[PDB]
């Protein structure tokens, strides 16, 4: 079923690979070459997760846990029950994510739009590959990755932060938290402003951009504008994900001691008496 | 005559007459329930 205005946009062409061999739709979904690779990888990963859950002994969604191997295996392959299933599922997940991005690229090409959305999704892919491939390779063992479990991947986060004593004192984690909080404050403000412009009190007329610019200069003395706010939101979100990846890749391979001690360079600067 | 809702005096009278009939039935059922509970397990 189509929307009232959708039929004129459903034309042929704009594929990276495959031509018209996969150029069709299933329901609302578009399929192409990267829609077939996404389906295969995602289904294989989910089926393997549930087979591992059956072999573990519990089907409770809270308690399912598939874990990486021991550190003694290094960068080699472990037996499938002692951590090899985690490696296979990691490969499947990487394939699925890359196929999802390349499918978004083809949809953008067909609609004649810019390629901003796949580029933004590439940042989240980079933060995940840093956690399961880059830090583990640098540190020398696949067993440094986090496990695949709803409540067991929080234990990993807790133990990894106390391994550097007081994680709040990590300089690049402080930058990343600030970016997260600022994105949420700006999203709230933007949504509120647009809704308040489009929904006035009963018996009144709707408002325009002039009114929105004026309210914000009256409130705080500045207005970024209707085009600037989207650029700023995108930049804030992408900066949040990039700094998160940095905070984790320096904690292991670059710094070994507690994070408070790193601040000693400021406390013993020669200028101080 | 004052009206912030759009109804007239007679419509409001009829609506209130219907409303109080249900309020009294609810109150009577609650009163009977509260009496049996005191005879079984007193609270004062």
């Amino acid at each position: 079923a189509l929307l009232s205005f959708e039929r004129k946009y459903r034309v042929r062409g704009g594929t990276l690979i495959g031509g018209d061999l996969f150029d069709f739709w299933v329901g609302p979904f578009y399929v192409g070459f990267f829609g077939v690779t996404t389906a295969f990888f995602a289904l294989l990963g989910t089926i393997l997760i549930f087979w591992g859950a059956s072999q573990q002994g519990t089907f409770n969604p809270w308690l399912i846990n598939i874990a990486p191997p021991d550190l003694s295996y290094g960068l080699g392959m472990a037996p499938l029950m002692e951590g090899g299933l985690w490696q296979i599922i990691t490969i499947c997940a990487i394939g699925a994510f890359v196929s999802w991005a390349l499918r978004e690229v083809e949809i953008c090409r067909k609609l004649g739009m810019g390629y901003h959305v796949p580029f933004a999704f590439s940042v989240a892919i980079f933060a995940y590959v840093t956690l399961v491939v880059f830090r583990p390779l640098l540190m020398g063992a696949w067993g440094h990755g986090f496990p695949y479990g709803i409540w067991s991947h929080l234990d990993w986060v807790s133990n990894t932060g106390y391994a550097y004593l007081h994680f709040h004192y990590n300089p690049a984690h402080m930058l990343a938290v600030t970016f997260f909080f600022t994105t949420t404050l700006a999203l709230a403000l933007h949504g509120a402003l647009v809704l308040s412009a489009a929904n006035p009190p009963k018996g009144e007329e709707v408002k325009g951009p002039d009114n929105e610019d004026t309210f914000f200069r009256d409130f705080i003395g500045y207005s970024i504008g209707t085009l600037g706010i989207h650029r700023v939101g995108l930049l804030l979100a992408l900066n949040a994900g990039f700094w998160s990846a940095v905070c984790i890749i320096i904690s292991g391979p670059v710094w070994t001691k507690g994070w408070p001690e790193w601040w000693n360079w400021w406390l013993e600067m020669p200028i101080w008496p | 005559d004052l009206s912030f809702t759009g109804l007239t005096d007679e419509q409001a009278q009829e609506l209130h007459s219907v409303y109080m009939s249900g309020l009294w039935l609810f109150s009577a059922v609650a009163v009977v329930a509260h009496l049996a509970t005191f005879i079984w397990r007193p609270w004062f």
Binding site: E6, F180, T184, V194, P201, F215, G225, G233 | -
Partner: protein
């Protein structure tokens, strides 16, 4: 490559805008005087000012500056009025809440009295800035969405500083005024009551924070890709649908099977952002007053994982083998 629309190619400047008006006469309280910044104009608007000065804003500014100076002067006096040491240890100093032995009574000025006087001036300042945000919509004849979104965060602010200390029976439960000292409070609060990961409302707050950041990456990117069809003029797209809204909707419909409208995406954004402090405050209000150990609560309610292997380094290696000897 094609132009990407992150930086403006050429800027144009004209007479400064002074703002719209109606029968409420907003011009009488607006300052005269504006500026222009070409550095900012590469991204957004270049005009600076003017601003509106009511009584709510003036009271908020005065009482917030008072709070800042009571804290700053207390910090300066704690160090012996030594300016170079004041600069050296700025991130480490704080104005500490009272001691637990005093309960909810008034403590000595050396042990939390200045903390309570300064907390009363910050309270007054914050509630005044909110009354200003409500009055300006009323004066501008707009909706009150901004004030409601601000009150959502004020709810968690008040829970952290006012409500929970009263329900617990001590002013000592409040947060200190410092950079590092306030982060130590966060870690100590998490440790004292088990593990805050296992508080379900903390998990819900994390869910909504993650969701709000994912949505500005998606919404910002989507709006920047349809700017070649006039997509940044959202209000007129709401009042008269154009091809930018259609293409933006169809992208997500073909991607994940459902989509939104030009007006309706902002409701999604408003709710995810607003829901973070509400769930966070509900989670904080239940700690100590009801639940004292969240990991034991998780064990009771059966969502705590179990591990089979052993603990200890000598279950996996040898001290000599770790040194290369």
């Amino acid at each position: 490559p094609e132009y990407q629309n992150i930086f403006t190619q050429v800027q144009v400047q004209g007479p400064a805008e002074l703002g719209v008006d109606n029968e409420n006469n907003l011009t009488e309280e607006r300052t005269t005087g504006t500026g222009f910044s070409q550095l900012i104009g590469w991204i957004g608007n270049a005009q600076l000012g003017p601003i509106y000065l009511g009584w709510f804003g003036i009271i908020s500014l005065v009482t917030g500056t008072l709070w800042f100076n009571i804290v700053g002067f207390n910090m300066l006096s704690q160090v012996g009025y030594s300016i170079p040491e004041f600069i050296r240890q700025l991130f480490w100093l704080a104005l500490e809440p009272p001691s637990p032995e005093y309960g909810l009574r008034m403590p000595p000025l050396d042990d939390g009295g200045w903390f309570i006087i300064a907390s009363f001036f910050l309270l007054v300042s914050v509630i005044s800035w909110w009354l200003r945000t409500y009055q300006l919509a009323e004066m501008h004849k707009m909706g009150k969405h901004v004030a409601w979104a601000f009150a959502a965060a004020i709810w968690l602010f008040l829970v952290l500083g006012l409500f929970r200390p009263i329900l617990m029976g001590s002013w000592s439960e409040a947060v200190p005024y410092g950079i590092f000292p306030h982060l130590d409070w966060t870690t100590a609060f998490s440790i004292r009551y088990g593990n805050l990961y296992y508080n379900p409302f903390h998990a819900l707050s994390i869910v909504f924070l993650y969701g709000s950041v994912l949505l500005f990456a998606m919404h910002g990117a989507t709006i920047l890709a349809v700017t070649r069809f006039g997509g940044d003029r959202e209000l007129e797209q709401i009042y008269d649908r154009g091809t930018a809204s259609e293409r933006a909707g169809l992208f997500w419909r073909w991607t994940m099977g459902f989509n939104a409208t030009m007006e309706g995406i902002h409701r999604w954004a408003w709710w995810f952002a607003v829901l973070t402090p509400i769930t966070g405050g509900i989670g904080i209000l239940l700690t100590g007053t009801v639940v004292d150990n969240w990991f034991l609560w998780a064990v009771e309610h059966n969502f705590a994982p179990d591990y089979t292997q052993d603990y200890g380094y000598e279950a996996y290696t040898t001290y000599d083998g770790f040194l290369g000897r």
